[PDB]
């Protein structure tokens, strides 16, 4: 009856909001600069929000758009103080390098000699370097040039920075909060029944791969399938395994790095030669586990296309080399693995010993993904290379009998695969409500 | 006892969440948000630091001009215009959560903030006249 306004400070009410997220990390230097992040609390406080049901929309999330610009800016920051390789854009005299091997695999790597500047501006030098075939083009004789010379400048990565992803934790400023959808069968959109709040997200490695998602987070039940319009064939389907299907990759050739003084203070790191055999870089994935895991994807794909329909896996249908292959980084080199042996299967309405092998090629001059004029030279890695990782998801694409083929050269699809359960909200701690209280 | 944690009673009833206000109060200027380097992460953390003190001081300034400095629960002299909400006391504090309450009171929250503002300015004018003797 007699009711007055009463003010409350610190009431549990929040609103959807965009804000700048800083980085937390655990205790040389990597491109992700995780040494500059605030140390993660060893006790990552998670608070459960009983009786709370929040709306989510992983396809409008700003955390992925913020991480997308962050990682690009981190690479930009890491390549700033390094060496410009514009003197390397010069006429190359190249020959095939040894190993009179299987026909048309000797051109896959080349032995190239060229005239290079020295520490004295007026005195040239004749040096040589081993270059992969994908990093050079012909002139039309045996003359060549670096692949990037007509489109982009090139900057070699400072060889002391590690390309190995370190787990990043994204945090919200004071007065904001991160909400996590703890729904074990969460689509990525809609009212999440189970919700908790966290100061910082879990550890997320900034792994940029294609087709196959590597070293990611696993679902706890079944195997979810996420698109914003699954009935639309132009929206990439993001699948997420619950079991990790392992993959072993290697560059067996024992390379040597040869430093070349191209100027005062500037040194270009060439590929010296190969100690021992010249073999083929490749990846192994157990044929048994990949068939089982490729079947779980089929079961969940059925719920969107019918218990009776037949779905088929085919290989990529063209595009740039990064998107037609399982491209990734391994021990410092950038592999490009043919995946026709992974998506060549037709499944009806209703091995066990060996594994399937994937021939990978290797690039050193890799181009920027959504920009032109900027390109990076990855320095040669010495020794034998071998990395072991799990495939925890895919990036598929429907054509519109159903046929699914991989792809996806958009970095923020990688970040969606980890940030789907997180959402940023701002706290509004002021609340007014009536009660029979009166001042004085 | 209970102690649900930060925002732990966001789904609870307004009367139940209203007893654990200090839980949300202390987390409005801390978090984990020493040299100032202007790296890609360093700029990000600086913005996170300035932003928190900004949004914190806006709320404290409102509590100030309302006469509710340093209070988590202050009572006022603005009567409850039933056109804001014709709900009764029990069907609010023992039924609604602060989130769904804020949803339906949101239109008039600016009207209420003005009445609280001038109620305090007229109140401080009266207290001066009373102490003038």
């Amino acid at each position, epitope marked *: 009856e007699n009711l007055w306004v009463t003010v409350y400070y610190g009431v549990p009410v929040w609103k959807d909001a965009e804000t700048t997220l800083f980085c937390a990390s655990d205790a040389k230097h990597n491109v992700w600069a995780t040494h500059a992040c605030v140390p993660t609390d060893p006790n990552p406080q998670e608070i459960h929000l009983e*009786n709370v*049901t*929040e*709306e989510f929309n992983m396809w409008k999330n700003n955390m992925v758009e913020q991480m997308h610009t962050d990682i690009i800016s981190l690479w930009d920051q890491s390549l700033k103080p390094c060496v410009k390789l514009t003197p390397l854009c010069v006429t190359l005299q190249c020959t095939n390098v040894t190993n009179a091997i299987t026909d048309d695999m000797r051109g896959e790597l080349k032995n190239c000699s060229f005239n290079m500047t020295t520490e004295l501006r007026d005195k040239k030098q004749k040096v040589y370097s081993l270059f992969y075939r994908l990093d050079v083009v012909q002139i039309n004789n045996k003359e060549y040039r670096l692949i990037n010379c007509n489109t982009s400048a090139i900057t070699q990565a400072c060889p002391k920075v590690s390309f190995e992803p370190i787990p990043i934790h994204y945090c919200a400023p004071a007065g904001f909060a991160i909400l996590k959808c703890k729904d074990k069968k969460f689509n990525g959109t*809609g*009212p*999440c*029944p189970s919700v908790s709040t966290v100061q910082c997200t879990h550890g997320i490695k900034p792994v940029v791969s294609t087709q196959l998602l590597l070293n990611g987070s696993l679902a706890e039940e079944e195997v979810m399938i996420r698109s914003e319009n699954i009935t639309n064939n132009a929206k990439n389907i993001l699948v997420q395994f619950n079991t990790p299907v392992q993959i072993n990759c290697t560059r067996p050739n024992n390379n040597t790095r040869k430093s070349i003084r191209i100027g005062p203070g500037q040194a270009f790191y060439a590929t010296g030669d190969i100690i021992g055999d010249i073999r083929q870089a490749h990846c192994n994935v157990s044929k048994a586990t990949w068939n089982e895991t490729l079947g779980k994807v089929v079961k969940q794909l059925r719920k969107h296309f019918g218990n009776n329909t037949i779905i088929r896996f085919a290989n990529s249908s063209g595009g740039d080399l990064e998107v037609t292959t399982h491209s990734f980084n391994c021990g410092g080199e950038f592999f490009y693995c043919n995946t026709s042996g992974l998506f060549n299967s037709t499944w009806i309405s209703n091995g066990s010993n060996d594994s399937i092998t994937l021939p990978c090629r290797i690039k050193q001059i890799i181009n920027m993904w959504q920009r032109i004029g900027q390109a990076m030279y990855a320095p040669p890695i010495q020794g034998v290379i071998r990395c072991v990782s799990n495939i925890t998801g895919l990036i598929l694409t429907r054509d519109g009998t159903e046929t699914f083929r991989p792809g996806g050269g958009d970095m923020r699809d990688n970040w969606r695969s980890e940030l789907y359960k997180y959402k940023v909200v701002k706290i509004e701690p002021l609340g007014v409500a009536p009660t029979r209280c009166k001042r004085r | 006892a209970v102690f649900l944690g930060f925002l732990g009673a966001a789904g609870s*009833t307004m*009367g*139940a969440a209203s007893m654990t206000l200090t839980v949300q109060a202390r987390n409005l200027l801390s978090g984990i948000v020493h040299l100032l380097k202007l790296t890609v992460w360093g700029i990000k953390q600086l913005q996170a630091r300035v932003l928190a003190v900004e949004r914190y001081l806006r709320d404290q300034q409102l509590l100030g001009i309302w006469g509710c400095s340093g209070k988590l629960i202050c009572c006022t002299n603005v009567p409850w215009n039933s056109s804001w909400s014709n709900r009764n006391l*029990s*069907e609010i504090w*023992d*039924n609604m959560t602060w*989130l*769904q309450w804020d949803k339906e009171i949101s239109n008039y929250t600016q009207i209420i903030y003005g009445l609280l503002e001038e109620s305090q300015n007229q109140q401080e004018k009266n207290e001066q006249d009373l102490l003038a003797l």
Partner: nanobody, 128 residues
Framework: QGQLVQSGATTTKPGSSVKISCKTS????????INWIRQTAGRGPEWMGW????????????????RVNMTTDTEVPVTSFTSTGAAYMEIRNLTSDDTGTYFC????????????????WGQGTLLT
């Protein structure tokens, strides 16, 4: 708002056991109890029991203590404050003297001294 659509008008004979369905909309199904009330003709209205769609806890009259099975299945989020639930009613040593109209009604408030009080009712179901 709030709706509680009830099942059909079942018709059986003594000895059997029938299930009554109560399907809810327009409100969070977990926040309020579900009450079962009986309006027989040869007696005054009888409160049978209520059950907690959140805690699973149940409470019924001694006249139904070992004769009735009250159950609910988990709700389905529609929006932040709207879900859809269901409540089930069963009788054991059933005769024909239990004939009448059966209602389902949700609780009144989420806290206080009248939490479970049957506030919003269904349209009822005729029986044997």
């Amino acid at each position: 708002q709030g709706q509680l659509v009830q099942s059909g008008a079942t018709t059986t004979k003594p000895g059997s056991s029938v299930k009554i369905s109560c399907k809810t909309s327009g409100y969070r199904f977990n926040f309020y109890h579900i009450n079962w009330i009986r309006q027989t003709a040869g007696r005054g209205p009888e409160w049978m029991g209520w059950i907690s769609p959140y805690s699973g806890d149940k409470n019924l009259a001694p006249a139904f203590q070992d004769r009735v099975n009250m159950t609910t299945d988990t709700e389905v989020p529609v929006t932040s404050f709207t879900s859809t639930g269901a409540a089930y009613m069963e009788i054991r040593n059933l005769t024909s003297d239990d004939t009448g109209t059966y209602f389902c009604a949700k609780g009144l408030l989420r806290d206080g001294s009248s939490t479970w009080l049957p506030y919003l009712w269904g349209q009822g179901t005729l029986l044997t």
